[PDB]
């Protein structure tokens, strides 16, 4: 409470539906950063969890553009705002993250000599971001469907987040069914490089 | 050596050096003690036409005694710090 | 939940066999097993709400 | 970060951090390695009573 | 009387106390009180008294010496530390009594109370010599 | 510091038999049995010097324990350090 | 501490003859300490009872009194009982002071010279 | 602090039970608290500190 | 073990206004750090080298 | 200021005779100490509803209060869990001592006689309160000599 | 334009989690005089049995015992230095906690677990956000001074208003 | 009150309600709290070996804090800490109140004549204490031997016939053995001549560590400011004044690698 020690993040019931990572959606309770949340309780997208809001809250529809839509949070919605959060937490975690590498690259073509496997992306997803997925969903680009990733610098590849249709999740994420995981291959000598 | 006056960081102001900013609070009990004391801004500026005074442990006597201010340079027990004799209200 | 009702039994019924060392030991575990089950039962009840932390948490 | 020379002098047992963890384990400031269970008891039959008291949680 | 334990008297007093039957007929004989007594009391209520002159007059009625208090433990140290010439306390050697090398810059360690002994103590910790040898005459260990 | 006042939990019962947590100090510490064991200047045993030949029993065990051929004199008979007037010097 | 009475039998000469005048010493204190009259509900726990004489903390009145019920513990020092548990803490402090340090200061009728106002 | 072994040591320092240290606001505008406003309590200067410090308590209860 | 104990560094020049509990660290017989012990005591060893 | 900040310690029950141990300075400025206040044996005031006359039933409200308060005092004085491990506080023990409130052992002053050893106490009474065996109280050894 | 001096190393002089004597500087903090102005807030505020030196903001323990850092539950940026005096109290548990978890019989939901503390508080005090977020009305922060003379409230503390948890 | 502030009834305040203490609630009688409650010269530095002692940078904020542990977890507020820590007072003093420091015998710094200078007092509170240490050892040595006390114990009697080994508690002698007389020379009934323990001279030390030319110089060192004639390095300025100097006489020598 003190001016020195302030809650680094606070609880929040979203009224609107914000796209960003700190954002939420209609009626879920989320601990979002303090500075961000404080310009929501003024903005009206969020309201601190008084005991009243813990049952219903008047969320927002872009149709009439006002806080009319009553979204009552019974135990059933609380099984819906969990799977819908747990889903778009994997989204905003791999989309925000920038997963690094250290590899060996003798030769001129700036070509990683032991190119990457879809095993070796789910491996650097679970390693750095703890995002546990199926490496059967990671579709590579066209340049790297043949030989694996294979080249230093910034590569990206698409991760398919399948189960997003009964969560009613669109326009609050950039792409309902994909996400761009963003590699980077920082070449290193035998001292710090593997494989 | 020359270079008698230094020039790197000539400090704006400087508390210790100011017409009477550092004052030897010598003890009024003429035990020759003194406790050098820089007059704070409460007395740096001439808030006090009176010569500063304070109560400080006089380590010689082991008693709290007066401390009248006085220039820090000078013999602290001159033939002026002799008190005129007096017969106390004790004795026959 | 009955640390008071238990001792009063021990004072007026035990006191010759059961060394109260056991009791204050018995009270120190029963206030932990109950504690941890509250921390486990909660840990299982978030794991449905989608908090998903590993064995090492 | 453990940089600095004094961390070099004291991780290695250099000049006067020669026995560095000046208080390592195996000293107790409080109970000086003597078990706190009274054996001086009124009746010798009841000396075995105090055995098993909790020294902490 | 001083070392009486309630139920430990089950041992032979003929070897522990050396009574006849009719005297300890009271305390520890057959059908003595301890036999009737259980382990646990019923009520305990205890006062505290101060030394007076009747206690001195008692040790004479008997003929034993009167027990007296020891010179306090800490009070004896206040003096043994305050009657030492300061030079016995100043930092006095390059190696603190434990073996470290007190360099400058730490004002705490400029005080070497225990005096060091450089040429002494290599038998300890290497030959299996006992820790009993280390200690001084009053029991406190010396350091090497 | 303010001490320990505003007294202990302010409960009372016949049970009242489950807590010690003496303030650490009142547990072999402020029962000041021996903390001077570490903070008292030693009184060293007799010291063998070049001139002063003071024997010590504490060292003599570390020889009386050894498996040494050529056995050693018993300690008491090895001592130069013990009836006109209760026996003369 | 200042150990003094309310009434002090001070001699005085009336018609050239010595006669005893019961002196009301109480009026001597209050003139010395004008702080005791100016009483406000916090002053008995005040730090310095008299900012003139900050040395003075208690004034032990010693006047023989005939009432049965003596003064209440608010104004009497406990002078009976074992004041400790583990050791009468006098014999501890009785170890530290030396047989050659002061216990008395008897005033001087005629002083050797202006310094010796009292003999210790 | 000077200990026993110093090259020079000092006589008896004053036991704090006499002439105590008033816990009052530091003149430094950073070391005074927030709510503290400069005390412009206009008052007839009471001379003797027995009757001065008395004002600083609230003993109507 | 021969410390060449020396006195405080700042004990005569500027006193007014220095810290209250550091105007006395100047009063103890501190050892000089051994890096100088060996320098000064080097001119004394040379008496009969080898 | 408040009355709580400045108040003489008033023990709710003075069984342990705590005034004699946990000394507190007489707060006042004028401390009246005569010479005759040496004779007086400054025992605490008698508390009414004296424990010694209670009976140790298991439903008596006073007793339950006195049952724990006694076991409260024993833990305070190192006794209950260590010296006497399993105290089955059942009976209302009151070991009255034949007491004279004497300041020291002596002979009768005026009569030039040895003080007759007081007879075996026959009844509990306020005068025989502070000479009982209570929860840690103090008794001048002169009185316990019988 | 000018020169600059080298930034000294203001880091730990013990190992956190391990035992500690009082003559050890626990941490030599930056008295962050932004540039020798007179207002700073140290990183590691003092804790149990740890006392801060005023001048150089260095924490020295006051009693020998094992040391530790308590990151504030509210904001993980503000830390205390706890020294718990008993070295046997933690050693004789560590030697168990690390002997149990070797046999795979120790639970990882321990309070001392680093990554669990976020959830640990919330199992016991489920609304602790609201207990520190709650803003107090100036009435209750200065409870009726008469309740102090009538003795209802043991002692009024008007400045201790901030919940440091 | 229903009358508009005219306080006329029940003017006499009813005395307040008493807040009792439960004496059973209190801590057990603690020996270590019996010793240090009084307040004396000092304890030991809490160190024979300097470890575990206390740091001088926190020796100000102690005094009863030997017991393990603010109004809250902590934030120190930077107020009443930095407002009491370095008060406007407590600076430019020289004698900070007796905190926890094992300085000279302050119990005996109070009991001693201020007349004597310092360096001749701290050398005399020790010779007082050095005797108070012998008086204490003799009582321990005489009592433990059941002997009536004897003060200048003869070194033959000391080391109580090989320090008898304390036959291997302590007991008073019977009151037949007691008597006021305690000097061996007076006990039996050597020369009974008496002399004090130490010589107190109201003389003041003439070497102050912070004064430059102070000290006791040799009988042939240059006395304080010899040849100087009241001026800095003034013995150089008085060289041209010399009638005739030697051929090798304190010439030019700019401190180069001096």
Write the DSSP string, F17-53: -------STTTTTSS-SSSTTTSS---PPP---SS--
E107: nearest CA in chain K? Answer: K23
> In the 8-state DSSP scheme, what is residue L57?
G
Task: Return the CA Rg of chain B.
Answer: 18
The answer to whether residue D22 neighbours chain L at the CB level (below 8 Å) is: yes
What are the CA-CA distances from residue B13 to residues B10, B39, G5, L219 (Å)?
9, 15, 61, 49
The sign one gets for the Cα dihedral K143, K148, K151, K155 is: positive
Contact (CB, 8 A) for K13 and D6: yes
Q: CB of L81 within 8 A of CB of E132?
A: no
Identify the three-state secondary structure at position K121.
Answer: helix
- Contact status, residue L19 vs residue J12, Cβ threshold 8 Å: no
Residue of E127, E124, E128 lying closest to E142 (CA atoms): E124
How far apart, in whole angstroms, are the C-alpha atoms of residue I28 and residue I9? 10
A78: chain C residues, CB-CB within 8 Å: 49
3-state helix, strand, coil in chain I (%, to 5): 30, 5, 70
- Residue from K159, K132, K12, K7 nearest K81 by CA: K12
Rounded CA separation J75/F20 (Å) = 10
L42 vs D36, E13, K62, L39, L101, CA distance in Å?
Answer: 30, 50, 18, 8, 7
> In Å, how far is H57's CA from the nearest CA of chain G?
8
Residues A102 and A134 sit within 8 Å (Cβ to Cβ): no
Query: For residue L17, what are its two tokens?
Result: 């309600």
HSE, side-chain direction, 13 A CA sphere, residue H60? 5
Given CA atoms J79, J82, J84, J90 in this order, what sign does their dihedral have? positive
Beta bridge mates, G12: G19
CB K56 within 8 A of CB K94: no
Element (H, E) at K120: helix K117-124
Q: Would you say K46 and K81 are in contact if contact means Cβ atoms under 8 Å apart? A: yes
G10 three-state secondary structure: strand
User: Looking at beta carbons, which residues of chain L come within 8 Å of G93?
Assistant: 38, 40
Provide DSSP, A124-178.
HHHHHT-----TTS-B--STTSSS-S-BSB--EEE------STT---SSSS-SS-
> Six-digit token pair at L176?
């037949």
Using DSSP's 3-state secondary structure scheme, residue A61 falls into strand
- Residue D1 CA, chain-centre distance (Å), reads 28
**Contact call for G and I: 3+ CB–CB distances under 8 Å:** no
Q: Which two tokens stand for residue B12?
A: 């704006």
Q: Which residues contact L61 (CB under 8 A, 6 or more apart)?
A: K51, L85
Positive or negative CA dihedral for K127, K128, K134, K140? Answer: positive
Cα separation, A51 vs A46, whole angstroms: 15
Which CB contacts under 8 angstroms, 24+ apart, belong to K132-141?
K132/A1, K132/A7, K132/K74, K132/K163, K132/K165, K133/A1, K133/A7, K133/A10, K133/A48, K134/A1, K135/A1, K136/K161
Residues K105-114: contacts with CB under 8 Å, at least 24 apart = K107/C36, K107/C40, K108/C55, K108/C56, K108/C57, K109/C36, K109/C39, K109/C40, K109/C43, K109/C57, K113/C56, K113/C57
Q: How many residues does chain I have?
A: 50
Q: Is the dihedral of CA H40, H46, H47, H52 positive or negative?
A: negative
Choose from B2, B35, B61, B69 for mutation: most chain L CBs within 10 A. Answer: B35
Give the separation between CA A116 and CA A99, rounded to whole angstroms.
13
Retrieve residue G2's tokens: 């200042």
d(CA E61, CA J145): 14
**What DSSP string describes C1-57?**
--HHHHHHHHHHH-SSSS-HHHHHHHHHHHHHHHHHHHHHHHHHHHHHHT----TT-
Q: This structure's resolution (angstroms)? A: 3.6
Is the separation of the CB atoms in A72 and A103 below 8 Å? no
CB J128 within 8 A of CB J96: yes
Chains B and D touch (3+ CB pairs under 8 A): no
H or E stretch covering G91? helix G89-96
Closest-approach residue (CA) in chain G for E75: G92
Cβ within 8 Å of residue E42, ≥6 positions away: J88, J89, J90, J91, J93
The residue with tokens 């789910």 is A122
The C-alpha atoms of residue L114 and residue H11 are separated, in whole angstroms, by 9
Phi and psi at residue K77, to the nearest 5°: -90, -15
Select from I11, I16, I21 the Cβ nearest to the Cβ of L56. Answer: I21
Touching check for J4 and chain H: CB below 8 Å? no
Q: Do the chains contact at K115 and C55, CB–CB below 8 Å?
A: no
Q: Dihedral, CA atoms, L191, L192, L193, L194, nearest 10 degrees?
A: 140
DSSP state of K31: -
Counted residue by residue, chain C has a size of 57
**Residue I31 to residue I2: CA distance in whole angstroms:** 10
J94 by DSSP, 3-state: which? coil
Inter-chain residue contact A86 with C50, CB threshold 8 Å: yes
CA distance linking residue H16 with residue L99, whole number of Å? 9
User: What are the residues whose beta carbons fall under 8 Å from the beta carbon of G22, sequence distance 6 or more?
Assistant: G7, G8, G9
Q: Give the DSSP per-residue string, B33-60.
A: -EEEEE--HHHHSSS-SSPPEEEEEETT
Task: Name the phi and psi angles at G8, rounded to 5.
Answer: -120, 125
d(CA L5, CA D51): 69
Q: Kindly list the residues from chain A whose CB atom is less than 8 angstroms away from the CB atom of residue L75.
A: 2, 4-5
Contact B91 G117 (CB under 8 A): yes
**Which residue bears the tokens 């019988």?**
J146
Contact D30 F33 (CB under 8 A): no
Structure tokens at E55: 């206690």
- Backbone φ and ψ for K117, nearest 5 degrees, come out as -55, -30
B35·L93 Cβ contact <8 A? yes
Distance CA F3, CA F25 (A): 14
* Residues β-bridged to residue E129: E124
Q: Which two tokens stand for residue F88?
A: 């003369």
| Chain J interface, Cβ < 8 Å to K | 2-5
K83, A16 Cβ separation under 8 angstroms: no
Q: What distance in Å separates residue K122's CA from the closest CA in chain A?
A: 13
Give the Cα separation of C49 and H4 in Å (integer): 67
| Minimum CA–CA partner of C2 in chain F | F15
Candidates I20, C38, J87, L126; CA nearest to G98 is L126
Distance CA F74, CA A3 (A): 80
Distances (CA, A) of G98 to E84, E86, J25, J79, L148: 17, 21, 27, 39, 20
Contacts of residue C48, Cβ cutoff 8 Å, sequence gap at least 6? A79, A82
Instruction: For chain L, say whether J73 makes contact (Cβ under 8 Å).
Output: yes
- C-beta atoms of F6 and K86 within 8 A: no
| Helix C20-49 and helix A77-96, axial crossing angle in degrees, nearest 10 | 80
Query: ∠ CA K135-K136-K142 to the nearest 5 degrees?
Result: 160
Q: Determine whether L132 is exposed, middle or buried from the number of CB atoms within 10 Å of its CB (0-12, 13-18, 19+).
A: buried
In 3D space, the residue among J120, J1, J124, J105 whose CA is nearest the CA of residue J52 turns out to be J124
Please give the angle made by the CA atoms of G12, G15 and G21, to the nearest 5 degrees.
30
Q: How was this structure determined?
A: cryo-EM
For residue D22, give the nearest of L66, H3, E100, E134 by alpha carbon. E100
Contact E103, I31 (CB under 8 A): yes
Judged on CB neighbours under 10 Å (0-12, 13-18, 19+), I17 is middle
Q: Quote the CA–CA distance of L65 and L52 in Å, as a whole number.
A: 14
Number of F–J residue contacts, CB under 8 Å: 14
Which phi and psi (to 5°) does residue L201 adopt? -110, 125
Q: Do C24 and F15 touch (CB under 8 A)?
A: no
Two tokens, residue L19? 């807040």
> What is the gyration radius of the CA atoms in chain A, in angstroms?
21
Side-chain-side CA neighbours of H34 within 13 Å: the count stands at 5
Q: Which residues pair with A158 in a beta bridge?
A: A139, A180
Q: Does D touch H (3+ CB pairs < 8 Å)? A: no
Running DSSP on this structure, what letter comes out for residue J81? I
| E-only strand ranges, chain L | 170-171
Do H10 and H19 touch, CB atoms closer than 8 A?
Answer: no
Give the DSSP H or E segment for E15: helix E13-16
Compute the distance between CA of residue H31 and CA of residue L82 in angstroms, rounded to an integer: 7
């Amino acid at each position: 409470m003190a001016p020195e020690l302030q809650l680094e993040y606070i609880p929040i019931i979203f009224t609107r539906t914000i796209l960003g990572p700190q954002g939420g959606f209609a009626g879920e309770e989320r601990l979002i950063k303090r500075e961000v949340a404080q310009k929501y309780m003024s903005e009206g997208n969020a309201v601190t969890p008084s005991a009243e809001f813990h049952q219903g809250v008047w969320c927002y529809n872009p149709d009439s553009e006002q806080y009319d839509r009553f979204v009552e949070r019974n135990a059933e919605f609380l099984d819906f705002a969990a799977r819908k959060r747990q889903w778009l937490d994997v989204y905003w975690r791999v989309n925000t993250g920038y997963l690094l590498f250290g590899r060996q690259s003798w030769g001129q073509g700036w070509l990683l000599n032991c190119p990457l496997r879809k095993k070796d992306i789910a491996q650097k997803l679970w390693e750095q971001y703890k995002v546990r997925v199926d490496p059967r969903l990671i579709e590579f680009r066209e340049k790297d469907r043949r030989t694996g990733i294979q080249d230093l610098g910034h590569n990206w590849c698409w991760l398919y987040l399948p189960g997003a249709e009964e969560l009613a999740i669109d326009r609050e994420v950039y792409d309902n069914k994909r996400v761009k995981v963003r590699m980077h291959i920082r070449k290193m000598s035998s001292y710090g490089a593997l494989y | 050596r020359l270079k008698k006056r230094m020039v790197g960081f000539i400090p704006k102001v400087i508390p210790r050096k100011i017409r009477n900013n550092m004052v030897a609070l010598r003890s009024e009990a003429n035990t020759g003690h003194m406790e050098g004391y820089i007059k704070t801004e409460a007395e740096r500026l001439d808030a006090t036409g009176r010569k500063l005074q304070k109560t400080m442990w006089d380590p010689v006597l082991q008693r709290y005694t007066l401390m009248k201010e006085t220039k820090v340079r000078g013999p602290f027990l001159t033939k002026s710090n002799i008190a005129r004799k007096v017969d106390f209200p004790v004795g026959a | 939940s009955r640390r008071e009702a238990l001792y009063t039994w021990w004072h007026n019924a035990g006191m010759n066999v059961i060394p109260l060392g056991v009791l204050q030991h018995l009270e120190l575990v029963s206030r932990d097993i109950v504690a941890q089950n509250a921390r486990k039962s909660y840990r299982i009840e978030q794991h449905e709400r989608g908090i998903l932390r590993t064995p090492e948490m | 970060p453990r940089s600095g020379v004094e961390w070099h002098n004291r991780m290695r047992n250099r000049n006067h951090y020669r026995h560095w963890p000046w208080a390592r384990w195996t000293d107790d400031p409080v109970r000086f390695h003597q078990d706190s269970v009274c054996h001086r008891t009124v009746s010798a039959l009841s000396t075995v009573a105090n055995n098993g008291a909790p020294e902490w949680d | 009387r001083s070392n009486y334990r309630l139920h430990s008297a089950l041992t032979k007093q003929t070897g522990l106390k050396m009574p006849p039957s009719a005297s300890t007929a009271c305390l520890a004989s057959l059908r003595s009180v301890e036999r009737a007594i259980p382990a646990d009391p019923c009520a305990v209520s205890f006062f505290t008294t101060k030394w007076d002159i009747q206690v001195q007059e008692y040790y004479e009625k008997v003929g034993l010496p009167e027990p007296a208090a020891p010179v306090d433990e800490e009070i004896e140290a206040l003096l043994e530390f305050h009657a030492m010439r300061p030079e016995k306390l100043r930092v006095r050697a390059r190696h603190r009594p434990d073996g470290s090398v007190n360099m400058g810059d730490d004002p705490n360690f400029w005080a070497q109370a225990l005096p060091t002994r450089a040429m002494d103590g290599s038998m300890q910790r290497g030959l299996g010599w006992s820790r009993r040898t280390t200690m001084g005459a009053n029991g406190v260990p010396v350091v090497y | 510091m303010a001490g320990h006042f505003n007294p202990t939990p302010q409960a009372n019962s016949l049970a009242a038999t489950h807590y010690a947590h003496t303030p650490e100090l009142r547990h072999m510490a402020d029962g000041a049995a021996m903390s001077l064991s570490g903070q008292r200047i030693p009184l060293l045993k007799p010291t063998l010097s070049k001139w002063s030949r003071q024997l010590r029993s504490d060292i003599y065990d570390e020889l009386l324990k050894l498996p040494l051929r050529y056995a050693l004199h018993d300690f008491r008979t090895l001592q130069a350090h013990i009836h006109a007037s209760s026996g003369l010097s | 501490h200042l150990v003094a009475r309310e009434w002090i039998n001070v001699p005085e000469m009336k018609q050239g003859e010595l006669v005893e005048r019961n002196m009301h010493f109480w009026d001597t204190i209050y003139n010395v300490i004008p702080e005791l009259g100016l009483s406000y509900p916090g002053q008995k726990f005040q730090w310095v009872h008299s900012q003139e004489f900050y040395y003075l903390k208690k004034i032990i009145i010693t006047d023989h009194n005939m009432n049965l019920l003596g003064v209440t513990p608010m104004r009497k020092m406990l002078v009976w009982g074992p004041f400790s548990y583990y050791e009468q803490r006098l014999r501890r402090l009785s170890a530290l002071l030396h047989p050659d340090d002061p216990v008395l200061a008897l005033e001087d009728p005629n002083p050797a010279m202006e310094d010796k106002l009292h003999i210790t | 602090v000077l200990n026993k072994w110093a090259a020079v040591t000092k006589s008896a320092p004053p036991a704090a039970g006499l002439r105590p240290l008033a816990r009052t606001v530091s003149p430094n505008p950073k070391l005074r608290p927030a709510d503290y406003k400069v005390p412009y309590v206009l008052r007839t200067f009471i001379k003797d500190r027995h009757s001065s410090e008395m004002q600083h308590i609230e003993n109507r209860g | 073990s021969r410390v060449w104990v020396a006195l405080g560094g700042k004990m005569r020049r500027r006193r007014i206004g220095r810290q209250i509990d550091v105007k006395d660290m100047r009063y103890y017989w501190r050892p000089i750090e051994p890096q100088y012990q060996r320098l000064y005591m080097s001119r004394l060893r040379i008496k009969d080298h080898s | 200021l408040s009355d709580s900040m400045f108040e003489y310690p008033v023990y709710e029950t003075e069984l342990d005779t705590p005034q004699l141990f946990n000394l507190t300075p007489p707060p006042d400025f004028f401390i009246y100490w005569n010479a005759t206040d040496f004779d007086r044996t400054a025992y605490p005031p008698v508390p009414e509803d004296d424990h010694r006359v209670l009976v140790p039933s298991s439903q008596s409200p006073r007793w339950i209060e006195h049952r724990a308060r006694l076991l409260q005092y024993l833990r305070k004085h190192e006794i209950m869990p260590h010296y006497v491990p399993h105290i089955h506080a059942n009976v209302n023990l009151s070991v009255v001592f034949p007491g004279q409130y004497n300041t020291r052992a002596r002979l009768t002053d005026e009569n030039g006689d040895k003080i007759p050893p007081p007879p075996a106490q026959t009844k509990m009474t306020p005068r025989n309160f502070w000479f009982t065996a209570h929860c840690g109280n103090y008794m001048e050894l002169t009185d316990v000599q019988q | 334009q000018a020169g600059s001096p080298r930034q000294k190393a203001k880091l730990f002089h013990v190992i956190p989690g391990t035992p500690v004597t009082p003559v050890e500087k626990l941490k030599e903090q930056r008295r962050r005089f932004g540039q020798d102005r007179y207002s700073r807030q140290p990183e590691y505020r003092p804790g149990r049995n740890v006392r801060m030196d005023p001048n150089t903001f260095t924490l020295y323990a006051t009693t020998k015992g094992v040391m530790t850092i308590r990151t504030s539950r509210i904001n993980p940026s503000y830390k205390w230095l706890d020294v718990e005096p008993d070295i046997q109290k933690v050693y004789r548990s560590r030697c168990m906690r690390a002997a149990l978890q070797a046999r795979g019989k120790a639970s990882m939901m321990v309070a001392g677990n680093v990554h669990y503390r976020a959830e640990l508080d919330h199992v016991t005090e489920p609304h602790w956000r609201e207990r520190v977020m709650r803003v107090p009305k100036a009435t209750e922060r200065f409870q009726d001074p008469n309740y102090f003379t009538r003795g209802l409230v043991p002692s009024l503390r008007p400045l201790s208003r901030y919940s440091y948890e | 009150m229903l009358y508009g502030g005219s306080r006329v009834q029940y003017l006499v305040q009813p005395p307040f309600t008493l807040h009792k203490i439960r004496s059973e609630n209190l801590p057990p009688p603690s020996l270590y709290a019996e010793r240090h409650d009084l307040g004396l010269e000092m304890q030991l530095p809490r160190d024979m070996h300097v470890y575990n002692s206390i740091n001088m940078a926190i020796q100000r904020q102690v005094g009863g804090d030997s017991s393990t542990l603010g109004g809250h977890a902590d934030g120190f507020d930077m107020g009443a800490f930095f407002t009491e820590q370095h008060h406007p007072e407590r600076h430019h003093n020289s004698s900070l109140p007796y905190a926890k420091h094992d300085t000279n015998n302050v119990l005996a710094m109070r009991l001693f004549p201020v007349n004597v200078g310092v360096r001749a007092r701290t050398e005399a509170i020790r010779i007082r204490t050095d005797d108070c240490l012998q008086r204490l050892r003799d009582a321990d040595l005489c009592a433990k031997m059941r002997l009536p006390l004897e003060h200048p114990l003869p070194l033959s009697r000391r080391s109580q016939y090989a320090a008898i080994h304390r036959v291997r508690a302590a007991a008073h002698p019977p009151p037949s053995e007691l008597s006021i007389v305690t000097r061996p020379v007076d006990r039996l009934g050597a020369s009974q001549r008496w002399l004090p323990l130490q010589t107190l001279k109201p003389m003041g030390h003439n070497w102050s560590a912070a004064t430059r030319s102070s000290g006791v110089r040799g009988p042939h060192m240059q006395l304080m400011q010899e040849r100087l004639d009241q001026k800095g390095f003034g013995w150089k300025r008085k060289s041209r004044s010399l009638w005739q100097q030697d051929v090798a006489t304190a010439g030019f020598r700019p401190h180069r690698y001096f």
